Amino acid sequence: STLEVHGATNTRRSLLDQIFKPVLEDTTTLGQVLDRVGAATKKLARFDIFKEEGFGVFLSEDISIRVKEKSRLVFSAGTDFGNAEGSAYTNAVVRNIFGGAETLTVNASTGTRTRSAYNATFSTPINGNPDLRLSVEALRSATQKPWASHEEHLTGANLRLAWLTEKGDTHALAYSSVWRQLTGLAPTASPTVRADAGDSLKSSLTHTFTRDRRDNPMLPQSGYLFRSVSELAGWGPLNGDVSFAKTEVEASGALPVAIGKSGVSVGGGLRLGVLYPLPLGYSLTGAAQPSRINDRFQLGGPNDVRGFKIGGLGPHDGVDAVGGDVFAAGSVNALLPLPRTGPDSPLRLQLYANAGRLVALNSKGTDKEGKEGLAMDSAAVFKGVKSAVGKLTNGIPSLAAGVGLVYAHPVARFELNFSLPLVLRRGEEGRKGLQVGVGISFL
Amino acid sequence: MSSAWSHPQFEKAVQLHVWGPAFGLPSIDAECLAAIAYLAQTLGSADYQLIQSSPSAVPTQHLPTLYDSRTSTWIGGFTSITAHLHAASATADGTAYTAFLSAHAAPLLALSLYVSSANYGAATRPAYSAVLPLPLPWTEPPAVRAAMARRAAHLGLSSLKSRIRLEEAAREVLDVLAEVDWAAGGGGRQVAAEVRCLAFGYLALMLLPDVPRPWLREIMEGRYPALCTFVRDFRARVFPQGGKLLPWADGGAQASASASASASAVALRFVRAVMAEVPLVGEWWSRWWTARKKREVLASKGAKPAPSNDLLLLLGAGLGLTVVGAGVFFYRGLPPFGEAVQVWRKPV
Amino acid sequence: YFPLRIYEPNELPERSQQLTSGDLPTLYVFSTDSDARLGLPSFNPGCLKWQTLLRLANLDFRILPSTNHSSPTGSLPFLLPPRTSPTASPAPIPASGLLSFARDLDLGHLDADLPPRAQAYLALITHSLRNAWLCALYLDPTHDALLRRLYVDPASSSRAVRAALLHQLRRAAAEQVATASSGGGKIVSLAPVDSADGIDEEAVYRSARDALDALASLLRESETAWFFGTERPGSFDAALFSYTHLMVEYMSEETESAKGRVSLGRMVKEAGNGELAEHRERMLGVAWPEWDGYRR
């Protein structure tokens, strides 16, 4: 009947008129009325503009809803875990500019690898869906790359259209455009790192899918995860210095074993990835420039394949970790619970064993180019990707093993593992003792 | 270019401004002392005048500066002043040693007097402050010391036995200068008369200051006595009584600044020197003001440039107004977008 | 002890297998991709000096175009020797060690202590002609298309990155000219002059004209066709040639009748009695004896 919503002063009467005007079209089925009011109230909290302690729906006789708005300006600072050891971020948010919209200014100067990282992210919802958002970002970074000894200065702006669906899957569609200046070369830099040291553009367009059915992200005991990032740079209406097509499929899972609810949780995982060079312009047949070190994959590390350096497992020019074009990964786990403790503490005892491959792409077998030697046509690139995919499954992969002691914070996952490399390639730099892993994404 | 990085586009009884006396010398700059010496040798004292100034008191923004009253022209720099107001191996040697003294003896006096922060803070900065009017020596000697410390780079030396590096980098200049035979009419190399004034300016600012870290006066007095004899004899000949018989304007060396130093002019100089340090718009104020002063020096020369480009000042004002408007729009906020009570009725 | 199985290493990508796999040493310069296949002179004078010295020392090498960011120091001309293994290469040689790399029996004439008069005359080249090259290339709007072609258009193909790189180039060059005090030593604030408005570019021009006439007189003194009466050219000859060649190449126009201002190549060709254009032809005829493509 007659609905009153008190205490919402910095919200428009369009943003919360799209919500409660469908509700009043109900022209004695009291349960349907209460369920529709509860559905509208759960939709209203999907906008992140209200405090969870304010939602009081006090009926009469009809309806009378109350809310408490969040404050507008939120300055904040602290220490985040962006899969690194440390970070010192400052975070200024303006919570509700007109209705639903927000701005986030982030300034995270970190002494570890990213000495500066500036941000500005405006974000609106589209047509009153609280789950469909649209973001206009702008960045400026300078991040040290200590595996392949240089720095990368990234200035540009991207436009992301996220979408959370009704079944918990999250789509994404960004148009990025960067600068990617490579400089800051150490004296131990390789000739491969000196061959690519300068300016790029990389105007790209990348879809991201996620399907996260793990019951706990920081310590899975059941469920699965499917994630699929897929980029297209340079080809067609996009313009830049690089023009490629890069995909990546990551899987996961966990299966419980019996004794109660004892946390055994045999784990699993698999990553793949292929970087394909395309021509520039509206054609598929055409000469294609090979990839640069900005774009190639980096395998190995504490977060990625346990038992190796933070860049290992690939082509190495001297000591520098230059990248590959086709990779694979994967692991098994055991995650046994600790004795004299119930299956409720976040402490677990891991028994991992990973393996990985990271090969590059060359043009052997057809070398009649001579001069103008960098551009490669479609048949040469197709035979190169065929040979690299064949060189994945030719030989025992670069495998390691170990034990560990996982602690599962709500924002990160600390591991502290003792690894032991078993099978290597030459010049691949695996670590043999105690290794520390902090962050979210783990394999 | 934004027209501030290009050559300017053109349509289709002298008075020498200098610094002030210091260390018993008629000026504290090397190029100003050189220009004073050249005009004292060539011109007579009833032909020229000497005005005590700062780089914010002339439009050239470079203090050894001539104002020719016949044509109202503004000429800045020693080589420009001597290009105005005007066998082959002697001329080529004069050109070479002029280019050498300007380029390799200028960062050595800089290391002696401006980079060494026990020399600057105890000898150089009080002598700079004793010739400017009272609110000005808080803005101009930092800019002077910053420029001289920039020039003293490409030498690998600073203020921090690490004394043989100074001696080697000073021998690398004084060995070239010691073969010119400056105080001579015979023997050795021979240069023109104006190169001897430039050499006197640099070498007398090296030798004659009374400093607490005397690392350059002792190298000259120990290894190169001919240059010290040159400086002492040139100073005894051209400037007896310490540069007080020179034709300073309006009676004296300190009363020569009283024309262009009123309350309004000094206040404007200090205000503009303060406005250039504002963290965002102070670059574009400085670029717009420098372009304006260059335009008026060029119009004094005889040219007729195209002045209509104010995008530097408009760009600085746009950046400042953008930051201020963003801060007020996001901190003060907008008026509220809804009421407290918002009733929805069932439509009939 | 523990890695139980080690395989042969992974091959490098195709880009490094093409760019970094030569059998001669490689000098990384400022050139174009059609000039570097032949070995022609660079368009940067600080690279052409060392390239001329490495070609007078009878050293077998290649050139390849590079950017400043790849150098072991800040500035460009450096050398990378050939690989020994396909995945390992020796250390780079900066510009200060190039004549020490090249020994090619007796290179003592290219690396020798100059007399002090020669150092006063070398200050002419390193200041009065360097500032003239920088002012006339980077700040003159006539040479804007040449500046874009030589430095900005090979860097990327995006107009925003191109415009920003051209702005940083002009800012850096205007900083350089306003430090050396031919026509630039102004004091405006605590920050250095980085625009063309704090440069008097008639003093830069007149100092270039006097520098060229003094160097022509010094060359007339010598009477054995190279400086100071030598029988083979030295580092002074490569230092002067690195500016006189690029002035006759890229800065000899016909513009000179509507502005005054005889250009830099015509000032080189007219300095003295043509002592320096003849020296430029004699220095090309010794170090590049197969190239007949010069004078523009």
Author numbering:
A (entry chain B): 47 to 73, 78 to 111, 127 to 324, 329 to 512
B (entry chain C): -34 to -23, 2 to 75, 105 to 178, 237 to 424
C (entry chain A): 26 to 128, 139 to 289, 292 to 333
Sentences from the paper on this structure:
The SAM complex monomer determined from lipid nanodiscs was fitted into half of dimer 1, revealing that they are in an almost identical conformation. Therefore, we performed particle symmetry expansion in dimer 1, focused on only half of the dimer, and proceeded to refine this monomer to a final resolution of 3.0 Å, resulting in more clearly resolved side chain densities. The first transmembrane α-helix of Sam37 is well defined, spanning the membrane adjacent to the Sam50 β-barrel, but making no contact with the β-barrel. The POTRA domain adopts the classic βααββ fold, and is positioned away from the barrel lumen, allowing substrate access in this conformation. On the cytosolic side of the membrane, Sam50 loops L1–L8 extend from the surface, positioning loops L4, L7, and L8 to interact with several N-terminal residues of Sam35. Loop 7 contains a surface-exposed α-helix that sits parallel to the membrane, while L6 extends deep into the empty barrel. In both lipid and detergent, the Sam50 β-barrel adopts a kidney bean shape, with dimensions 50 by 40 Å. It is only partially closed at the interface, making no direct interactions between strands β1 and β16. The Sam50 β-barrel is only partially closed, and PyMOL analysis does not identify any interactions at the lateral gate. The Sam50 semi-conserved asparagine on L6 forms two hydrogen bonds with β16; one with the C-terminal residue (L512) and another with S510, which is located after the glycine kink in β16.
The SAM complex facilitates outer membrane β-barrel precursor protein folding and insertion into the outer membrane. Sam50 forms a 16-stranded β-barrel which is minimally closed between strands β1 and β16.
